[model samples]
Target chain A: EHVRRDLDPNEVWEIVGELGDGAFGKVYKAKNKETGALAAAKVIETKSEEELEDYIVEIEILATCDHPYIVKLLGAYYHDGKLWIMIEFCPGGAVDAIMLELDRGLTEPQIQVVCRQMLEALNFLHSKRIIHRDLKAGNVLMTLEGDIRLADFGVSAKNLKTLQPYWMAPEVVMCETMKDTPYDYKADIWSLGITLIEMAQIEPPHHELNPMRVLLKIAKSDPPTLLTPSKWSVEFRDFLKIALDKNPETRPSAAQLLEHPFVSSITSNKALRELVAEAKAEVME
Target chain B: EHVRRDLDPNEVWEIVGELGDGAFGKVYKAKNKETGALAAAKVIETKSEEELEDYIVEIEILATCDHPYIVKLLGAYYHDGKLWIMIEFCPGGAVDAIMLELDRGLTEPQIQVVCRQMLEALNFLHSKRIIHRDLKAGNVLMTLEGDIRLADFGVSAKNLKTLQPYWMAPEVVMCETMKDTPYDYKADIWSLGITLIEMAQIEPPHHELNPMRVLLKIAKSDPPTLLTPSKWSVEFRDFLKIALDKNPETRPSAAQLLEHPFVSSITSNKALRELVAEAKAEVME
Candidate 1:
């Protein structure tokens, strides 16, 4: 005789809405019956060993991370050949929504705040030598309280032997073979720089090329330009420059970036308080 | 007494085929009636004084340039509200077509030859302090004898004052809005590196984003990754690293790039002779 489990599959929970699809699988916002709390559930269709392995890896990475800016993985369940990973719910959703809502663009102070928060989370992950290979805008989410969190580690891998993206460093782009290529914390710094720029511009630079062309340009082209004060501010441009350095060796470590002049300037400025207040007021209006 | 000038409005001789399109107008193959020699004629439809002034700027720049790898402007004519600029016709057509016809990607040695030839041309342009802001695979052409020449100067401005592609060096990309952003000739060098990569990959690196996203990625993202070397060599990757450096100041000058290890290796390699001979044989077949 098989023992009956306490968790009931027949119970119908009210669905809040569909979030989005990712490397893992489809995500949906639902209400939890146990605690009457809202949660995001990532449902992975497990058909093969590879799919199962990917689901496991994602769970492991999410479970290990516990930063405020990093999304928390609640629990996992396997039933009927499908894997379910429940995570903390952020009703405000992804940064893309905010960007679209604003229409015009985010101010420098707002961008700086987001960049700093992302850098902190990246620094934490880099400390454990974790590399988030896919760092697109959709992966960044914001809570109802206005706190940002980095989510979706479906494409993320441990060790991170090799990765490809336009935001990669020149050395990585120039290395023909990945055998001797070092996958260190520096790659995260590169991604953070890219994310910061995305926040400011609401688009990726060099978007004209298809994936193949973008890769070729990244591998073969020189380091791309950083944002300037005219496009932004001197502090912002300089900060972006340090993060987006062509030479990985010259790029500052995450810890060092925390104390960077541009980062610190924005964090400490009283003007930022007014700017944020204005932003919130405008949003409310 | 009066003199009658020979003129035929509808008797414009079509020489070869359509070369390419530019910001100013479309370029086509044509022949000089007086000498019956093949040449390229740029057809510009100008309706305003500003458009006319733009073509004049292009004419002045092309007339001043005198380099073997650089396309020479033979003459210019204005008729029926259209401006026609004649240039030396390159029978081999654009680099994109050649790469496509070859089917197989170019070997390292072949790429080195192309890179070196382009560097020589860029060095000349840089010496005159002229920026070829719109350098790409489409902008380069070759002769029947495999002599490469840089073309398309509609967007090329004299004295280096222009709103360059955003993916270029930060100073140049942000130059339009930012004052005190002194730009040098290194911007062209950066573009050349991108051109080489595009030729090798037959596409742009970041080809996914629309124009706005491409511009943003170029400004914020680090250089892209070069992975899966199916056709390109390890040595070629090394050459592109320095060429595509993000910091324009750190990128090797054209003269310096000419003396690099990759350049010297390709120039001195006996294998290149075999490769070229094979390519020629295949073309004949």
Candidate 2:
């Protein structure tokens, strides 16, 4: 039972315009009509029994959470003939766009920062003992301050059924027709390792291939390593090897990834600004 | 004359939901279908001649910038019979939520952190000679790490046609329907000052009580000051005074505020975490 706060439709939010829409309903970039503060309102139509149930659980499950790594889920309301969940707006977009626009992609220094941020976030999530189940670069949003915040939170996982399977852990991908053994938060660390590559390549580990095929390659191979191993730092490559060890027993905890040399070397946020600029500039221009 | 990246509609984005609406078509949270990344897409219908030209200029002016203090403008798209521009999603929400939820308002350490971050953001904007005509708590989003960044910089006062009157500096408040030695960055400082009060009281300076008479009050009153000054530290109180100084010239610059004791004394992010949690607890679940 969350501290549910249902708001009146017209009074609280001035639905400015459509931000985006998908299988759920619509996402609006709303403003506090009275205060002018920005918020993302995910509105579900409620006509469908299946849709409304999924949304209600999405709002209720995490009503008792506060973490530095996860995205803040603001108040949830089932008011004015719709189910609306308010969330913080991350204006920094995502790591996917940063990689998409950059010419040389991310230098190792930049990768370290992104990796450390995701690890820290995952560390926090793992500490909660919850498997992210679906972890990808797209599931993470950047702070304008050049850090990352974990998002989507598996709340709507049943809808899209987890993000691109390419970023899933070997254990996660091997789920036998939706009834796999419970993999813990270490699964998120594997995804974090892959997401680091995603940050550099701007695509998941296997962008050129299809999902069903990618799953086998991940399950049996010596784990996906950086394509340009010669160009990347040895520490980063080694970090990936252990993180993607295929055997869930051998995989490191999300906490262990934080102490890895690949992340520990990047230390402060100052090391990231120049790289963030180049990538964002490329995407924007 | 600006760079235009035409998208093929369904191929690039899966419009996740309607984000909000403006004079144009609407802003939707469009997904980068390939990477599964989230983005705010502002869509404009082709029929309106005035809206198209206005948005096109917006795309050019802000362009694609990567500043730690500012949000990243993803890119522009013209496809499927509509024009679109994408942006980063900030998940920390706005400082307004911190004010509205917390019973006694934010802790001193948290407020000081915000003041420093905003001063840095304003300094960055000033260095670029960009006047953020709209600078208020609502326009400022937080980092999961507890820092803040400025948003909506592209919506200049020239195009807004309406402003949050309470956040207005003394000079800006006196618009002969809005112009002047045309208020610049220092006006943002005064707005920051009033925003400080808003952070505590859950309303901008006096906008709530005198919504109808807000303009009149701003134009006639001697700037404004915290009545219960004893409750706050002398340094903190003085910072507000110089920030909300009636004369723009007398007001402290954002840079000066950064050096002021209230902000300069802030040395540890460790000191700010509890406050961010107090904030996130109420803002989120």
Candidate 3:
């Protein structure tokens, strides 16, 4: 039996406000009554007995994922027909939210920081044979210190559940069409490419298309590229080219991508903190 | 189900040599076949089903203890009628072993570093409502860098197991004599006081007495004091006074003791490294 049994969330934590809606529940900013430490709590109401059991498996995976760039799962509890997951709170919000507040996108230097940090996170998970099936701009969070904290491992490979198609890899899109085409960790690499583009232009390529059309187009078309290709660095373009390769076999792994000039040339996290500060200030207005 | 299922230990690890004997098993210096990383593996062969189940509970407790001063459990496996636990290896051996090799104990400054680090570890465990039932010099390990790594959580409050009587708190001894009195985390504080004396003199007080006689003396007589009280500073004497208090109600908690002049005024781990180097050199000679 696990040490952490079902705990009464009400007894330990008090919700301050809603952070946002998650894949399985509503996430809230919470305070530990005993220690006064702030945390994000994801509360899910399971619809069936099987669903409750599945969530337990996902929480176990979340507990083992300890790395600098990955979000830490503090505690998990079940109370009042709901499952509550306590995690390290990222006060700077997700990268998508930061872009939304700016009404534009991150600068090249800022994008370099996110790219390097996210690759480090992906490399960690890939080494453990875990795939973040739902990697996107929305799942990449920013701590107040401007460090990257990859979130939303609640929808990992253990469940194989799919989310939005905008960031879906071509092989994953073809899986519905061909029915037998299986995708692996390379799928996340494809999503990371789309996420990097989303950081540059505030949205992934082909955002204009409908979800079904996006899936079909991704399955049938050549790898998606930047709209204003020449506007970005050649190193950046080369990084995306390998990541968005249509053939999963040719796509670079997270560790391989980390050594790319575009990511390795990046050094300090100082540039990222300015973006977080600007985003926070904009939200205040 | 847990992600880490039972696996064949032979497939992953190769035992190089025996480190020493533990409370429940023999510890070996093993190497990971895949990563070539050195680790300490404690292998226990259970005599009965109930004993196997009890070891499982202890392993679960070992997994949750994550602190800088605490030894990390890398993995656990049950195979070939034996339970194997993989942990971070300390090349410098236990504090007691170091003292034995050097033919002397640590200086006051070195003891100060161990005291502060062990207190931090205790504070972290107590915050999680975990009591380290057995705390002594042998369980306090030293890394090659001379950092204190508190090992041996296998004999904790979960199993209510007891070890050597030399470090046993008076209150715990009273539990046996009176048969009705219970002990708490304060028992560890008293042991810490005894361990400090052990570190100073290369053995705990009353080492010449028989185990049963030592237990009787601890239960009946006044708290043990330093051999040469004039040698140590007043702050050190005051720190031990509160820690060795016979009444559990009056004894200071680990966090409270951290603020004492003896522990708080100490900083820097550089001094401890010299002790480790000297011990290692003496062993080589």
By TM-score, the best candidate is 3
Chain A TM-score values, per prediction: 0.80, 0.82, 0.88
Ten-residue stretch with the least lDDT total in model 3 chain A? A163-172
lDDT of 3 by residue, B1-285 (tens): 111446788899999999887556677999999999889987778697646766676676677787899998788887767778899888878898888888888888888999999999988987876667677888899887869998887557243422111111122223332211223566677878888998999888778876646644564567778889898989889888878887775778898999999988776888788888898778779
User: Is candidate 1 or 2 superior in lDDT?
Assistant: 1
The candidate, 1 or 2, that scores higher on DockQ is 1
Model 1 regions lying over 4 Å from their true place: A1-15, A21-24, A158-183, A226-228, A265-285, B1-285
DockQ of each: 0.03, 0.01, 0.01
Candidate 3 local lDDT, A1-285, one digit each (tens): 221555677898899999877455677899999999889987878787657766776776678788999988878887667788899888888898888988988888998999999899888987887777677888888988889999877557233432111111121123332212233567778788888888899987777876646644564567778888778989888988888876665678888898899989777999999988898889789
Give TM per candidate.
0.45, 0.44, 0.46
- Give the chain B TM-score for each candidate: 0.77, 0.80, 0.88
* Whole-model lDDT values for every prediction: 0.64, 0.62, 0.75
Candidate 3: docking tier: incorrect
lDDT of 1 at A82: 57
What does candidate 2's lDDT look like per residue over A1-285, in tens digits?
542545465567677778766754677887876767777777766786655655665554444346765677766776656777777776666666555656446667877877787677666655654456556766677666776767775443442222211111111112221222234444565667677777666666656777555643453445567788888878988898888755565677767776778887676765566656666676656
Model 2 stretches with alpha carbons more than 4 Å out: A3-6, A22-25, A155-182, A279-284, B1-285
